[PDB]
Design a protein around this nucleic acid. Structure first.
Lengths: 91, 90, 106, 77, 94, 78, 102, 90
DNA sequence: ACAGGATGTATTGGCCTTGAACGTGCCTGGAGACTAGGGAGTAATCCCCTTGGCGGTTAAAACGCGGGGGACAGCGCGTACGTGCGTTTAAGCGGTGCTAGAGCTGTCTACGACCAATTGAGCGGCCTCGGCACCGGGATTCTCCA
DNA sequence: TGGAGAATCCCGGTGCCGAGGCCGCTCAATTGGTCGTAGACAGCTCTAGCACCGCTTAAACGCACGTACGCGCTGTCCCCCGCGTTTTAACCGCCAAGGGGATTACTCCCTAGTCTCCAGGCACGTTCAAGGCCAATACATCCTGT
C-alpha cells in the first residue's frame, strides 16, 4: 500500500490544478445560497474564487490532521484527528 | 469621558436591586468602546466599497448583520429600526 | 424648549455623543441623521443583555454587586456572546469549572 | 448535491496534504466541514450583495467575505 | 495518606474557582524590565502597565495549558510532555 | 537570571487552572521559553509605541494597543 | 518634473498621495509620506520578484507563474511570516513528506 | 487603475531577461494593495492615539517597524529615508 | 460491602472597614434656527453576460474480489512523579525622601489645503512573433528473486 | 537480484496563442500663488515612579519513599488498499434569448457651517450598608482493614 500512495503524494504535491469537479461544486454553491435569497445569479469568477478558497482550506486542514494522527502513533487519519485539529484551531 | 451613567441607568432598568463595582464598570466601558469601533469600521468600509461619502442607517444595519451572531443580530436590527422610526415620527 | 435626541428616540445612551465620535474618527465625510440613533440603540441592547446575564450570575452566588467574575461567567455560559467575545481577555475573570472525564476517579 | 464531492476527490485533497492512509468515516466528516465553511462564506457574500441592491453575486463580494474571515485571497481582484 | 491524584483534583477545583494571580509580582517585574533593557535603556514603567502584562501572560499560559492537556488525552496518556506543547503551538500557528 | 523567578510551583499552579492532573519534569523549561518569547513580542510593540510618542515611560495604553495588535484584546485597563 | 524622478523611484508618488487623501486616513497628509510609502512598496516588490525569478530560473523557464511566487514566498522566513494568512490562486503547496511515512 | 507598469519596470531592473504572465501580475497587484492598506491603517491609528491631524514620515516609519518582520523592516526604513532625503535635496 | 477514623469542607453569627452611591456647583458640549451647495434618489437606455438546451467523446466514478498490514487489546517491567515533612530564603508591607518627567499654557511661524491652467503619462486597441506545452521516441533508472 | 519491467527523464519537432510592443487621446498630475491654523518650543508646576530599610512569615527548596503509569512486546483479525470491468456524467462546442449590470442627465432635499443659549455630565466631599474575615461546628468524603 505504500508505493502507490507515496507516488500519488509526490504527484499531487507537484501540480497546481483543481481537485474537485466543477459542475458538482456549482450545484452545491447554488443549493446553499437558496437558504439566504431566492433567484440569485452568480458570476463565473465568484464560483472559481469559492472553489480555490475551499480547496486551500481543506488541504491545510488535512495537513494538521496528519500531524495529530502521527502524534497518536498512527499512519491512518480518523475523525478524532479532524475534531482535535478544529478544536485547537478555534473553529 | 466614559459610559458609566448610561450603564448604570440600563442596570437599574434590568435589575432594580443590583449594584456594580469599579472594575466591572471599566470592563463595561471597554466593551462599549470595542463594539463601537468594530461597527464604525465596518460601516466605513461598506461606504468606501460602494463609492459613497455618507454613513447612513443602512450601513449600520449591514455592519450589524455582518458582525453579530444569529439571534443577537435580529434583535439588534429590531431595536435599531424601532428607535429610528420613533425618532423620525417625533 | 430643548429636547435631547435620546429622549426623542426613547434611548438611554447618548445620541449626541455618538454623533460627535462618528465625525471625529475619520470614518466618512458626512454622517446621516439616523446613524447615531441606530448605533446607540444597538449598543444599549448589547449592554442590557450582558447586564441581565451578569445579574443572574451574581444572584446565584448570594451577592448584590456584579464583579468581573460574574461578567466572565455570563459571557462564557452563553453561546452567542462567547462567539462575539472569543478573543477577549477579561481581567480578574478567571475560568469556567471544567475537568475532563478521563481524569476523574474510576 | 453534497454527494458530488466524491471519495476520489477527498482522497486527492488528502494526498496533496501528505496523507498516506485514510479511514472510511473521513468522507462524511469532510463533507460536513466543507458545508459549514461554504455556508459562512456565502452568507457574508450575499449580505454584501443585498447591500448595493444587486441580484448578481460578484467575485469582489467573495473576496471581501474571505478577507473579513481572515482568509485573504490573491488573484481575483 | 491520600492516594496519588486526589490532591491534584482538589487543587484543580480550588484554582478553577479563584481569580487571583498565580505568579509572584516582584520576579515578574524584574523579568519584564530585563527583557525591556534590550530595546531601550533607562526605561520607566507605570504600575498599571506591568499589571496588564501579568494578566495577559497568565491568561495566555492557562489557555496554552488547556490545549496541551487536550493533546495528551489524544495519545492515551494523562501526563503532559513538551511534545504536547510543541504540537499545540504548531497547530495554533505560533 | 530572572527567568528562574518563574518557579516550578507557579507553573504547577498555572497548569492546575488549565485542568492538568499530571506534569512531566521537562515542562518547566519549555514554559519559561514560551513565556519569554511572548513577553519579547508584546514589550517590543509597546516600546515602539512609547518611542513614537516621544516619551520615556511605558503606560498601560501602550500595552493594550500592543496586545490588540497581536490579536489578544484585554478588557479592564482603560 | 515628476515627483517620482526627484526621489529616484519607479512607483507613482502622486497616485499614492491621491489614495492617501481620499481613503479617510487623516485630515491632512504631509509632503514626505507618499515618498516613504512608495519606496517601501517598491522595495518589497523587488524582493518578491527577485526570489520568484530565481525560482523560475531553477527550472528551465523564462516566465513567472503563480507557482514561482508561492515557492519564493514559502521558502523565505520573513516573507512567509508577513504573508502567513494569504492564499495564492494556482500556487499549490511546498512538497514535504513527513518521515515515519516512508 | 493598476500597478502593472511599475511592477514591470522593477522586474526589468532585477531580472532584465525574464517575463511575467497575466495571472501573476494580478497576484502582485493584490499584494501591493494589501500592503498599502495595512500601512495606511496603522499610520492612521498612530496619528489618532497621539491627537494629531497629519500623517507624516514618522508615522509611516513607525507603521513599517510595527508591521514588517525582522530584517525586512531595517531595509525598508533605509530605503524610505534615502528616498525622502533625495526628494528634499532636489 | 462495610464501619470506624482523621481530614477537608460547608455552615452560621458577630464586627467592621473601605468603596459605592448621593448631593452641589459650574462649565463646556449639545441643541435650535437659518442658509446655501452638492450628494444621491430616479428615469431611461444600451448591450454584456448569464442561463438553458443538446449531441458526442471519453476520462473518471462505481462495484466487486482477495490478501496483507496496521490498529487495538493484554501483559510485564522499571523509571519518575506525587505526597508529606523539616529547613532556608526572600516576597510583601509600611514609611520617608527625591527628584525625573508628564501635563498644561502662550506665542509665532512655516507647512499643507484650495484653485485655476496646461500638457504628457497611462489605459485601450491592434497587431506580431517566440515560449511553452504537447507530442512521440529512445535512454535511463527504481523494485523485487534464483 | 543486481536480473526483469514499468516509471521516469531525456531528447528533438511544432504550432498556436498569449505576452509584448506601437500609436491616438483624454484626464489626472505638476506649477504657481495665497492663507490660516497645527505643530513646535520654552517656561512652569507638581504628581508619581524609583530607591532604601527593617520586620515577619508565607512560599520556596530539598529529601526520601512507594505507587501508578509510560513504554515496549506480542498476537489476532478485519479493514483499507490495489486492480480489472462496466457504467455514468462531466466537459466541450454551439446556438439562442432576455435579465440586469453599468452610465448618464435633472432635480430636490439633506447634511455641513455659524451663532446663540442653557442644562446634562464631571470633579469633590461625606456616609452608611456590602462583603471579606474569624472562631466554632456539625456533615460529607476518602481510605483501609475485615
Amino acid at each position: 500500500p505504500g508505493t502507490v500512495a507515496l507516488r500519488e503524494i509526490r504527484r499531487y504535491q507537484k501540480s497546481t490544478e483543481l481537485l474537485i469537479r466543477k459542475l458538482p461544486f456549482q450545484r452545491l454553491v447554488r443549493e446553499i445560497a437558496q437558504d439566504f435569497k431566492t433567484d440569485l445569479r452568480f458570476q463565473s469568477a465568484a464560483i472559481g474564487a469559492l472553489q480555490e478558497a475551499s480547496e486551500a482550506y481543506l488541504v491545510g486542514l488535512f495537513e494538521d490532521t496528519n500531524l495529530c494522527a502521527i502524534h497518536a502513533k498512527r499512519v491512518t487519519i480518523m475523525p478524532k484527528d479532524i475534531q482535535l485539529a478544529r478544536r485547537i484551531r478555534g473553529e | 469621558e466614559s459610559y458609566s451613567v448610561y450603564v448604570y441607568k440600563v442596570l437599574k432598568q434590568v435589575h432594580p436591586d443590583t449594584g456594580i463595582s469599579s472594575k466591572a464598570m471599566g470592563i463595561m466601558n471597554s466593551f462599549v468602546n470595542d463594539i463601537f469601533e468594530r461597527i464604525a469600521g465596518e460601516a466605513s468600509r461598506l461606504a468606501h466599497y460602494n463609492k459613497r461619502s455618507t454613513i447612513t442607517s443602512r450601513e449600520i444595519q449591514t455592519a450589524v448583520r455582518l458582525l453579530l451572531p444569529g439571534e443577537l443580530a435580529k434583535h439588534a436590527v429590531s431595536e435599531g429600526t424601532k428607535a429610528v422610526t420613533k425618532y423620525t415620527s417625533s | 424648549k430643548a429636547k435631547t435626541r435620546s429622549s426623542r428616540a426613547g434611548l438611554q445612551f447618548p445620541v449626541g455623543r455618538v454623533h460627535r465620535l462618528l465625525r471625529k474618527g475619520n470614518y466618512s465625510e458626512r454622517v446621516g441623521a439616523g446613524a447615531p440613533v441606530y448605533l446607540a440603540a444597538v449598543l444599549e441592547y448589547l449592554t442590557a443583555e450582558i447586564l441581565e446575564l451578569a445579574g443572574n450570575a451574581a444572584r446565584d452566588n448570594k451577592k448584590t454587586r456584579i464583579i468581573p467574575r460574574h461578567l466572565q461567567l455570563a459571557i462564557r455560559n452563553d453561546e452567542e456572546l462567547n462567539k462575539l467575545l472569543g478573543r477577549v481577555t477579561i481581567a480578574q475573570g478567571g475560568v469556567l469549572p471544567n475537568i475532563q472525564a478521563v481524569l476523574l476517579p474510576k | 448535491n453534497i454527494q458530488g464531492i466524491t471519495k476520489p476527490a477527498i482522497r486527492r485533497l488528502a494526498r496533496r496534504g501528505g496523507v498516506k492512509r485514510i479511514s472510511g468515516l473521513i468522507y462524511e466528516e469532510t463533507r460536513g466541514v466543507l458545508k459549514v465553511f461554504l455556508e459562512n462564506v456565502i452568507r457574508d457574500a450575499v449580505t454584501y450583495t443585498e447591500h448595493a441592491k444587486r441580484k448578481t453575486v460578484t467575485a469582489m463580494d467573495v473576496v471581501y467575505a474571505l478577507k473579513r474571515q481572515g482568509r485573504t485571497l490573491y488573484g481575483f481582484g
